[PDB]
Amino acid sequence: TGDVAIYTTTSSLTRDLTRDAVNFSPKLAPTTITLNPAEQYQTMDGFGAAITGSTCYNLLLMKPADRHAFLTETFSDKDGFGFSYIRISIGCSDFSLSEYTCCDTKGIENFALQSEEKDYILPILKEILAINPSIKVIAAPWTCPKWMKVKSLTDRTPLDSWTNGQLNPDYYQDYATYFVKWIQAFKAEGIDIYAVTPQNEPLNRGNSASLYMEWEEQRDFVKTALGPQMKAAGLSTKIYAFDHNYNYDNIESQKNYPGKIYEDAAASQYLAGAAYHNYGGNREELLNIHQAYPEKELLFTETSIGTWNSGRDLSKRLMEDMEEVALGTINNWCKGVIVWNLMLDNDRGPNREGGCQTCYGAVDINNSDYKTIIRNSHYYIIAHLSSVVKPGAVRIATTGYTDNGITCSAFENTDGTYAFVLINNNEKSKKITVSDGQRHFAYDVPGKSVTSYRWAKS
Protein backbone atom coordinates (compact mmCIF):
# COMPACT_ATOMS: atom_id res chain seq x y z
CA THR A 1 0.00 0.00 0.00
CA GLY A 2 0.79 3.68 -0.36
CA ASP A 3 -0.12 6.76 -2.41
CA VAL A 4 0.69 5.13 -5.80
CA ALA A 5 -0.45 1.59 -6.81
CA ILE A 6 1.86 -0.16 -9.27
CA TYR A 7 1.67 -3.32 -11.45
CA THR A 8 4.89 -4.56 -13.06
CA THR A 9 5.61 -7.24 -15.67
CA THR A 10 9.01 -8.09 -17.07
CA SER A 11 9.63 -9.97 -20.24
CA SER A 12 11.79 -12.45 -18.25
CA LEU A 13 8.87 -13.01 -15.75
CA THR A 14 10.94 -11.86 -12.75
CA ARG A 15 7.77 -9.73 -12.32
CA ASP A 16 4.32 -11.01 -13.37
CA LEU A 17 1.63 -8.36 -12.88
CA THR A 18 3.38 -8.06 -9.50
CA ARG A 19 1.86 -5.45 -7.19
CA ASP A 20 3.97 -2.74 -5.57
CA ALA A 21 3.54 0.78 -4.16
CA VAL A 22 5.36 4.04 -3.52
CA ASN A 23 4.50 7.33 -1.81
CA PHE A 24 4.83 10.83 -3.18
CA SER A 25 8.26 12.51 -2.94
CA PRO A 26 8.08 15.99 -1.31
CA LYS A 27 9.78 18.88 -3.26
CA LEU A 28 13.12 18.85 -8.21
CA ALA A 29 14.78 15.92 -10.13
CA PRO A 30 16.16 14.53 -13.44
CA THR A 31 14.45 11.99 -15.77
CA THR A 32 10.96 13.44 -15.06
CA ILE A 33 7.84 12.73 -17.15
CA THR A 34 5.16 15.36 -16.50
CA LEU A 35 1.39 14.84 -17.05
CA ASN A 36 -0.50 17.84 -18.51
CA PRO A 37 -4.22 17.26 -17.68
CA ALA A 38 -5.10 20.43 -19.64
CA GLU A 39 -4.30 18.81 -22.99
CA GLN A 40 -6.95 16.11 -23.42
CA TYR A 41 -7.28 13.59 -26.27
CA GLN A 42 -9.83 10.74 -26.68
CA THR A 43 -12.05 9.25 -23.95
CA MET A 44 -11.43 5.54 -23.23
CA ASP A 45 -14.20 2.92 -23.47
CA GLY A 46 -12.28 -0.18 -22.36
CA PHE A 47 -9.89 -3.03 -23.00
CA GLY A 48 -10.26 -6.78 -23.17
CA ALA A 49 -10.49 -9.85 -25.33
CA ALA A 50 -12.82 -12.06 -27.39
CA ILE A 51 -15.28 -14.51 -25.74
CA THR A 52 -15.52 -17.08 -28.45
CA GLY A 53 -17.20 -20.48 -28.46
CA SER A 54 -13.78 -22.10 -27.90
CA THR A 55 -13.00 -19.82 -24.99
CA CYS A 56 -16.37 -20.69 -23.42
CA TYR A 57 -15.95 -24.45 -23.92
CA ASN A 58 -12.54 -24.30 -22.26
CA LEU A 59 -13.94 -22.18 -19.34
CA LEU A 60 -16.84 -24.59 -18.91
CA LEU A 61 -14.58 -27.61 -18.65
CA MET A 62 -12.85 -26.10 -15.58
CA LYS A 63 -14.02 -26.77 -12.06
CA PRO A 64 -16.59 -24.05 -11.25
CA ALA A 65 -14.56 -22.37 -8.55
CA ASP A 66 -11.44 -22.38 -10.75
CA ARG A 67 -13.41 -20.89 -13.59
CA HIS A 68 -14.89 -18.28 -11.29
CA ALA A 69 -11.45 -17.39 -9.81
CA PHE A 70 -10.04 -16.90 -13.32
CA LEU A 71 -12.97 -14.77 -14.46
CA THR A 72 -12.73 -12.74 -11.25
CA GLU A 73 -8.99 -12.15 -11.69
CA THR A 74 -9.62 -11.07 -15.24
CA PHE A 75 -12.81 -9.07 -15.12
CA SER A 76 -13.24 -7.73 -11.56
CA ASP A 77 -12.35 -4.09 -11.15
CA LYS A 78 -11.88 -4.26 -7.36
CA ASP A 79 -10.62 -7.88 -7.05
CA GLY A 80 -8.81 -8.36 -10.42
CA PHE A 81 -7.46 -6.60 -13.52
CA GLY A 82 -10.81 -5.19 -14.61
CA PHE A 83 -10.99 -6.21 -18.27
CA SER A 84 -13.72 -3.88 -19.55
CA TYR A 85 -14.51 -4.63 -23.21
CA ILE A 86 -15.32 -7.95 -24.83
CA ARG A 87 -15.95 -8.96 -28.41
CA ILE A 88 -18.28 -11.77 -29.54
CA SER A 89 -19.57 -13.15 -32.82
CA ILE A 90 -23.15 -12.79 -34.21
CA GLY A 91 -23.52 -16.40 -35.23
CA CYS A 92 -20.26 -18.30 -35.65
CA SER A 93 -16.63 -17.26 -35.78
CA ASP A 94 -13.63 -19.45 -36.63
CA PHE A 95 -13.51 -20.19 -32.90
CA SER A 96 -17.13 -21.39 -32.63
CA LEU A 97 -17.94 -25.09 -32.16
CA SER A 98 -19.58 -25.25 -35.61
CA GLU A 99 -20.47 -23.17 -38.64
CA TYR A 100 -23.92 -21.66 -38.08
CA THR A 101 -25.93 -18.44 -38.00
CA CYS A 102 -29.05 -17.46 -36.06
CA CYS A 103 -31.25 -17.99 -39.21
CA ASP A 104 -29.98 -20.95 -41.16
CA THR A 105 -33.44 -21.81 -42.39
CA LYS A 106 -34.59 -19.45 -45.11
CA GLY A 107 -36.85 -16.61 -44.01
CA ILE A 108 -36.04 -13.99 -41.36
CA GLU A 109 -39.14 -15.10 -39.46
CA ASN A 110 -37.07 -18.17 -38.48
CA PHE A 111 -34.64 -16.09 -36.38
CA ALA A 112 -33.38 -17.65 -33.14
CA LEU A 113 -30.33 -17.90 -30.91
CA GLN A 114 -28.77 -21.37 -31.33
CA SER A 115 -27.21 -23.96 -29.04
CA GLU A 116 -23.81 -22.23 -29.02
CA GLU A 117 -25.37 -19.09 -27.51
CA LYS A 118 -27.63 -20.96 -25.10
CA ASP A 119 -25.03 -23.45 -23.88
CA TYR A 120 -21.70 -21.59 -24.12
CA ILE A 121 -21.86 -17.89 -24.86
CA LEU A 122 -24.77 -16.82 -22.66
CA PRO A 123 -23.79 -18.72 -19.48
CA ILE A 124 -20.24 -17.35 -19.70
CA LEU A 125 -21.34 -13.76 -20.33
CA LYS A 126 -23.75 -13.97 -17.33
CA GLU A 127 -20.93 -14.99 -15.08
CA ILE A 128 -18.78 -12.16 -16.48
CA LEU A 129 -21.61 -9.64 -15.91
CA ALA A 130 -22.01 -10.82 -12.32
CA ILE A 131 -18.36 -9.89 -11.86
CA ASN A 132 -18.38 -6.71 -13.97
CA PRO A 133 -21.93 -5.50 -14.73
CA SER A 134 -20.82 -2.46 -16.82
CA ILE A 135 -18.66 -4.45 -19.28
CA LYS A 136 -18.93 -3.27 -22.90
CA VAL A 137 -19.75 -5.78 -25.60
CA ILE A 138 -18.97 -5.37 -29.30
CA ALA A 139 -20.12 -7.91 -31.84
CA ALA A 140 -19.83 -8.73 -35.50
CA PRO A 141 -21.00 -11.43 -37.90
CA TRP A 142 -18.46 -13.62 -39.66
CA THR A 143 -21.19 -14.42 -42.21
CA CYS A 144 -24.76 -13.63 -43.07
CA PRO A 145 -27.07 -16.62 -43.38
CA LYS A 146 -26.02 -18.51 -46.50
CA TRP A 147 -29.35 -17.95 -48.32
CA MET A 148 -28.70 -14.12 -48.15
CA LYS A 149 -25.59 -14.45 -50.30
CA VAL A 150 -24.95 -14.11 -54.03
CA LYS A 151 -21.76 -15.24 -55.77
CA SER A 152 -20.99 -11.63 -56.63
CA LEU A 153 -22.70 -8.35 -57.45
CA THR A 154 -21.95 -9.30 -61.08
CA ASP A 155 -23.51 -12.76 -60.79
CA ARG A 156 -26.54 -12.46 -58.54
CA THR A 157 -27.21 -16.22 -58.20
CA PRO A 158 -27.32 -17.95 -54.76
CA LEU A 159 -24.09 -19.02 -53.08
CA ASP A 160 -24.57 -21.78 -50.55
CA SER A 161 -21.25 -21.28 -48.77
CA TRP A 162 -20.18 -20.33 -45.24
CA THR A 163 -17.26 -18.42 -46.86
CA ASN A 164 -17.02 -15.81 -49.60
CA GLY A 165 -19.93 -14.32 -51.59
CA GLN A 166 -21.46 -10.90 -51.13
CA LEU A 167 -24.66 -9.79 -49.48
CA ASN A 168 -27.66 -9.78 -51.91
CA PRO A 169 -28.96 -6.17 -51.80
CA ASP A 170 -32.54 -7.58 -51.86
CA TYR A 171 -31.78 -8.90 -48.35
CA TYR A 172 -30.33 -5.70 -46.83
CA GLN A 173 -33.57 -4.96 -44.91
CA ASP A 174 -33.89 -8.64 -43.75
CA TYR A 175 -30.22 -8.69 -42.66
CA ALA A 176 -30.77 -5.48 -40.74
CA THR A 177 -33.72 -7.11 -39.05
CA TYR A 178 -31.36 -10.03 -38.17
CA PHE A 179 -29.09 -7.57 -36.28
CA VAL A 180 -32.02 -6.02 -34.42
CA LYS A 181 -33.52 -9.39 -33.38
CA TRP A 182 -30.05 -10.51 -32.28
CA ILE A 183 -29.36 -7.41 -30.22
CA GLN A 184 -32.88 -7.74 -28.76
CA ALA A 185 -32.52 -11.47 -27.96
CA PHE A 186 -29.28 -10.59 -26.03
CA LYS A 187 -31.05 -7.80 -24.16
CA ALA A 188 -33.80 -10.28 -23.13
CA GLU A 189 -30.99 -12.34 -21.55
CA GLY A 190 -29.71 -9.29 -19.65
CA ILE A 191 -26.81 -8.41 -21.98
CA ASP A 192 -26.44 -4.92 -23.49
CA ILE A 193 -24.70 -4.89 -26.86
CA TYR A 194 -22.63 -1.69 -26.79
CA ALA A 195 -21.55 -1.81 -30.44
CA VAL A 196 -21.55 -3.72 -33.65
CA THR A 197 -19.67 -3.79 -36.88
CA PRO A 198 -21.44 -4.98 -40.07
CA GLN A 199 -19.03 -7.77 -40.87
CA ASN A 200 -15.77 -9.13 -39.47
CA GLU A 201 -12.86 -8.51 -41.91
CA PRO A 202 -15.09 -7.62 -44.87
CA LEU A 203 -12.19 -7.82 -47.38
CA ASN A 204 -11.44 -11.46 -46.47
CA ARG A 205 -13.05 -14.20 -48.65
CA GLY A 206 -11.36 -17.12 -46.81
CA ASN A 207 -11.54 -18.18 -43.15
CA SER A 208 -14.02 -20.84 -41.96
CA ALA A 209 -16.82 -18.23 -42.23
CA SER A 210 -16.69 -14.99 -44.20
CA LEU A 211 -18.56 -12.57 -46.36
CA TYR A 212 -16.90 -10.13 -48.78
CA MET A 213 -18.21 -6.60 -48.36
CA GLU A 214 -16.68 -3.56 -50.15
CA TRP A 215 -17.10 -0.02 -48.74
CA GLU A 216 -19.87 0.91 -51.25
CA GLU A 217 -21.91 -2.12 -50.11
CA GLN A 218 -21.32 -1.40 -46.44
CA ARG A 219 -22.21 2.27 -47.06
CA ASP A 220 -25.52 1.16 -48.65
CA PHE A 221 -26.34 -1.53 -46.05
CA VAL A 222 -25.77 0.97 -43.26
CA LYS A 223 -27.57 4.00 -44.72
CA THR A 224 -30.63 2.12 -46.20
CA ALA A 225 -31.26 -0.67 -43.60
CA LEU A 226 -28.94 -1.21 -40.57
CA GLY A 227 -28.80 2.39 -39.45
CA PRO A 228 -32.50 3.24 -39.82
CA GLN A 229 -33.71 -0.17 -38.44
CA MET A 230 -31.52 0.01 -35.30
CA LYS A 231 -32.63 3.60 -34.66
CA ALA A 232 -36.37 2.81 -35.17
CA ALA A 233 -36.04 -0.15 -32.75
CA GLY A 234 -34.68 2.35 -30.15
CA LEU A 235 -31.19 0.72 -29.86
CA SER A 236 -28.33 2.75 -28.29
CA THR A 237 -25.94 0.26 -29.91
CA LYS A 238 -23.18 2.05 -31.86
CA ILE A 239 -22.05 1.02 -35.34
CA TYR A 240 -18.34 0.94 -36.31
CA ALA A 241 -17.29 0.61 -39.91
CA PHE A 242 -14.71 -1.65 -41.52
CA ASP A 243 -13.26 -4.01 -38.82
CA HIS A 244 -10.22 -4.98 -40.95
CA ASN A 245 -6.52 -4.18 -41.54
CA TYR A 246 -4.62 -0.88 -41.72
CA ASN A 247 -3.51 -1.47 -45.37
CA TYR A 248 -7.01 -2.46 -46.62
CA ASP A 249 -5.38 -5.69 -47.89
CA ASN A 250 -3.65 -3.57 -50.63
CA ILE A 251 -6.90 -3.43 -52.67
CA GLU A 252 -6.74 -0.08 -54.46
CA SER A 253 -10.53 0.55 -54.64
CA GLN A 254 -10.93 -0.20 -50.91
CA LYS A 255 -8.23 2.12 -49.55
CA ASN A 256 -9.66 4.63 -47.00
CA TYR A 257 -12.61 2.19 -46.60
CA PRO A 258 -14.20 3.96 -43.70
CA GLY A 259 -13.27 7.45 -44.91
CA LYS A 260 -15.13 6.82 -48.19
CA ILE A 261 -18.27 5.87 -46.21
CA TYR A 262 -17.98 8.93 -43.94
CA GLU A 263 -18.10 11.22 -46.97
CA ASP A 264 -21.64 9.90 -47.59
CA ALA A 265 -23.58 12.07 -45.10
CA ALA A 266 -26.57 9.68 -45.07
CA ALA A 267 -24.33 6.66 -44.12
CA SER A 268 -22.12 8.73 -41.78
CA GLN A 269 -24.90 9.87 -39.53
CA TYR A 270 -25.22 6.24 -38.29
CA LEU A 271 -21.45 5.54 -37.80
CA ALA A 272 -19.61 6.15 -34.53
CA GLY A 273 -16.35 5.44 -36.26
CA ALA A 274 -14.14 2.70 -37.51
CA ALA A 275 -12.70 -0.53 -36.14
CA TYR A 276 -9.22 -1.84 -37.09
CA HIS A 277 -7.18 -5.01 -36.91
CA ASN A 278 -3.38 -5.09 -37.35
CA TYR A 279 -2.69 -8.16 -39.49
CA GLY A 280 -1.46 -5.93 -42.38
CA GLY A 281 -0.24 -2.36 -42.79
CA ASN A 282 1.08 0.26 -40.42
CA ARG A 283 -0.66 1.77 -37.36
CA GLU A 284 0.09 5.29 -38.63
CA GLU A 285 -3.13 4.69 -40.62
CA LEU A 286 -4.95 5.37 -37.35
CA LEU A 287 -3.47 8.88 -37.16
CA ASN A 288 -4.24 9.43 -40.87
CA ILE A 289 -7.91 8.54 -40.39
CA HIS A 290 -8.17 10.47 -37.14
CA GLN A 291 -6.71 13.61 -38.75
CA ALA A 292 -9.03 13.33 -41.79
CA TYR A 293 -12.14 12.68 -39.68
CA PRO A 294 -11.55 13.90 -36.16
CA GLU A 295 -15.17 13.63 -34.98
CA LYS A 296 -15.21 9.89 -35.85
CA GLU A 297 -14.13 7.30 -33.26
CA LEU A 298 -11.37 4.68 -33.56
CA LEU A 299 -11.45 1.27 -31.94
CA PHE A 300 -8.86 -1.49 -31.99
CA THR A 301 -10.79 -4.80 -32.18
CA GLU A 302 -8.57 -7.73 -33.08
CA THR A 303 -5.06 -9.08 -33.07
CA SER A 304 -3.51 -12.52 -32.55
CA ILE A 305 -0.47 -14.37 -31.32
CA GLY A 306 0.42 -17.82 -32.51
CA THR A 307 3.07 -20.08 -34.06
CA TRP A 308 4.09 -17.44 -36.69
CA ASN A 309 5.39 -15.00 -34.04
CA SER A 310 6.57 -17.19 -31.15
CA GLY A 311 3.33 -16.26 -29.31
CA ARG A 312 4.20 -18.19 -26.11
CA ASP A 313 7.64 -16.57 -25.77
CA LEU A 314 7.10 -13.56 -23.61
CA SER A 315 10.77 -12.44 -24.09
CA LYS A 316 9.98 -11.97 -27.80
CA ARG A 317 6.37 -10.79 -27.40
CA LEU A 318 5.76 -8.53 -24.38
CA MET A 319 7.68 -5.37 -25.44
CA GLU A 320 6.63 -5.44 -29.10
CA ASP A 321 2.97 -6.16 -28.33
CA MET A 322 2.77 -3.51 -25.61
CA GLU A 323 4.30 -1.03 -28.11
CA GLU A 324 2.29 -1.89 -31.22
CA VAL A 325 -1.05 -3.18 -29.93
CA ALA A 326 -1.58 -1.49 -26.60
CA LEU A 327 0.11 1.96 -26.45
CA GLY A 328 0.67 2.26 -30.24
CA THR A 329 -3.09 2.20 -30.94
CA ILE A 330 -4.11 4.27 -27.92
CA ASN A 331 -1.48 6.96 -28.69
CA ASN A 332 -2.96 7.00 -32.23
CA TRP A 333 -6.48 7.77 -30.83
CA CYS A 334 -8.06 4.32 -30.30
CA LYS A 335 -10.67 4.42 -27.52
CA GLY A 336 -10.13 0.77 -26.72
CA VAL A 337 -8.08 -2.28 -27.41
CA ILE A 338 -9.42 -5.83 -27.79
CA VAL A 339 -7.36 -8.89 -28.53
CA TRP A 340 -8.65 -12.20 -29.92
CA ASN A 341 -9.51 -15.43 -27.95
CA LEU A 342 -9.21 -14.94 -24.26
CA MET A 343 -8.49 -18.66 -23.65
CA LEU A 344 -7.54 -21.55 -25.89
CA ASP A 345 -6.18 -24.90 -24.82
CA ASN A 346 -2.53 -26.02 -25.24
CA ASP A 347 -3.55 -27.67 -28.57
CA ARG A 348 -4.59 -24.22 -29.98
CA GLY A 349 -8.25 -25.02 -29.74
CA PRO A 350 -10.88 -25.99 -30.21
CA ASN A 351 -10.62 -24.53 -33.72
CA ARG A 352 -12.19 -24.81 -37.21
CA GLU A 353 -11.01 -26.23 -40.58
CA GLY A 354 -10.21 -23.20 -42.76
CA GLY A 355 -9.87 -21.02 -39.65
CA CYS A 356 -6.79 -20.21 -37.64
CA GLN A 357 -5.20 -23.41 -36.43
CA THR A 358 -1.90 -21.86 -35.29
CA CYS A 359 -3.37 -19.40 -32.75
CA TYR A 360 -2.66 -19.21 -29.04
CA GLY A 361 -4.95 -17.68 -26.43
CA ALA A 362 -4.35 -14.54 -24.46
CA VAL A 363 -4.00 -17.33 -21.85
CA ASP A 364 -3.59 -21.01 -22.60
CA ILE A 365 -5.23 -23.75 -20.47
CA ASN A 366 -3.92 -27.27 -20.19
CA ASN A 367 -6.49 -29.73 -21.57
CA SER A 368 -5.36 -32.60 -19.24
CA ASP A 369 -6.35 -30.78 -16.04
CA TYR A 370 -8.41 -27.70 -17.18
CA LYS A 371 -6.66 -26.03 -14.29
CA THR A 372 -3.13 -24.92 -15.19
CA ILE A 373 -3.25 -21.63 -17.06
CA ILE A 374 -0.28 -19.79 -18.61
CA ARG A 375 -0.59 -16.07 -19.40
CA ASN A 376 0.67 -14.97 -22.82
CA SER A 377 1.61 -11.47 -23.92
CA HIS A 378 -1.94 -10.50 -24.78
CA TYR A 379 -3.17 -11.05 -21.24
CA TYR A 380 -0.42 -8.80 -19.86
CA ILE A 381 -0.81 -5.99 -22.37
CA ILE A 382 -4.54 -5.76 -21.64
CA ALA A 383 -4.30 -6.14 -17.88
CA HIS A 384 -1.67 -3.35 -17.84
CA LEU A 385 -4.26 -1.06 -19.41
CA SER A 386 -7.45 -2.18 -17.70
CA SER A 387 -6.04 -2.35 -14.16
CA VAL A 388 -5.49 1.43 -14.06
CA VAL A 389 -7.34 2.97 -17.04
CA LYS A 390 -11.03 2.76 -16.19
CA PRO A 391 -13.98 3.37 -18.56
CA GLY A 392 -14.50 7.10 -19.25
CA ALA A 393 -10.85 7.99 -18.60
CA VAL A 394 -9.44 10.77 -20.71
CA ARG A 395 -6.00 10.35 -22.23
CA ILE A 396 -3.78 13.40 -21.52
CA ALA A 397 -0.45 14.69 -22.81
CA THR A 398 2.99 14.02 -21.34
CA THR A 399 6.24 15.95 -21.73
CA GLY A 400 9.83 15.52 -20.52
CA TYR A 401 12.04 12.47 -20.34
CA THR A 402 12.20 10.07 -23.28
CA ASP A 403 14.73 8.03 -25.10
CA ASN A 404 14.68 5.04 -27.36
CA GLY A 405 12.84 2.25 -25.57
CA ILE A 406 10.58 4.55 -23.50
CA THR A 407 6.89 4.72 -24.54
CA CYS A 408 4.09 5.93 -22.31
CA SER A 409 0.43 6.97 -22.12
CA ALA A 410 -1.24 8.97 -19.35
CA PHE A 411 -4.88 9.30 -18.39
CA GLU A 412 -7.31 10.92 -16.00
CA ASN A 413 -10.07 8.69 -14.69
CA THR A 414 -13.54 10.04 -13.85
CA ASP A 415 -13.00 9.07 -10.20
CA GLY A 416 -10.21 11.66 -9.74
CA THR A 417 -7.29 9.19 -10.14
CA TYR A 418 -4.50 9.54 -12.67
CA ALA A 419 -3.18 6.51 -14.55
CA PHE A 420 0.17 6.06 -16.27
CA VAL A 421 1.40 3.16 -18.37
CA LEU A 422 5.06 2.89 -19.26
CA ILE A 423 7.15 0.61 -21.38
CA ASN A 424 10.89 0.46 -20.61
CA ASN A 425 12.21 -1.46 -23.61
CA ASN A 426 15.86 -1.16 -22.49
CA GLU A 427 17.97 -3.82 -20.74
CA LYS A 428 18.62 -1.37 -17.86
CA SER A 429 16.54 -0.20 -14.96
CA LYS A 430 15.64 3.54 -14.95
CA LYS A 431 14.81 5.74 -11.95
CA ILE A 432 11.84 7.68 -13.43
CA THR A 433 10.07 10.57 -11.71
CA VAL A 434 6.41 11.12 -12.59
CA SER A 435 4.71 14.44 -11.92
CA ASP A 436 1.04 15.38 -12.35
CA GLY A 437 1.87 19.16 -12.03
CA GLN A 438 1.04 19.14 -8.27
CA ARG A 439 2.71 16.04 -6.74
CA HIS A 440 5.32 13.58 -7.90
CA PHE A 441 6.70 10.15 -7.19
CA ALA A 442 9.76 8.24 -8.27
CA TYR A 443 10.27 4.58 -9.05
CA ASP A 444 13.02 2.21 -10.10
CA VAL A 445 11.53 0.98 -13.39
CA PRO A 446 12.95 -2.45 -14.21
CA GLY A 447 14.47 -3.27 -17.56
CA LYS A 448 12.31 -4.91 -20.25
CA SER A 449 9.18 -4.01 -18.32
CA VAL A 450 5.62 -2.79 -18.43
CA THR A 451 4.58 -0.80 -15.41
CA SER A 452 1.17 0.65 -14.64
CA TYR A 453 0.53 3.33 -12.04
CA ARG A 454 -2.52 4.82 -10.41
CA TRP A 455 -2.84 7.60 -7.82
CA ALA A 456 -5.35 10.20 -6.50
CA LYS A 457 -5.18 13.83 -7.67
CA SER A 458 -4.90 16.22 -4.62
Numbering used by the authors: 36 to 62, 65 to 495
Please give me the paper's original passages concerning this structure.
The crystal structure revealed that BT3312 comprises two domains. The catalytic domain adopts a (β/α)8 barrel fold (TIM barrel), extending from residues Asp82 to Lys427, and a β-sandwich domain comprising sequences from both the N and C termini. The TIM barrel contains a central eight-stranded β-barrel, and extending from each β-strand is an α-helix. Extended loops link the α-helices with the β-barrel, and a small β-sheet comprising three anti-parallel strands is inserted into the loop connecting β-strand-8 and α-helix-8. The β-sandwich domain contains seven antiparallel β-strands in one sheet, with two contributed by the N-terminal region of the enzyme. Based on analysis of other clan GH-A members, the substrate-binding site of BT3312 is predicted to be positioned on top of the β-barrel. Inspection of this region of the enzyme reveals a deep U-shaped cleft that houses the catalytic residues. The active site cleft of BT3312 adopts a different topology to the substrate-binding regions of other GH-A endo-acting enzymes, which typically display linear or curved clefts that are open at both ends. Interestingly, NMR analysis of Candida glabrata 1,6-β-glucan revealed a hooked, U-shaped conformation, which is complementary to the topology of the substrate-binding region of BT3312 (see below). Thus, the candidate catalytic residues are Glu238 (acid/base) and Glu339 (nucleophile).
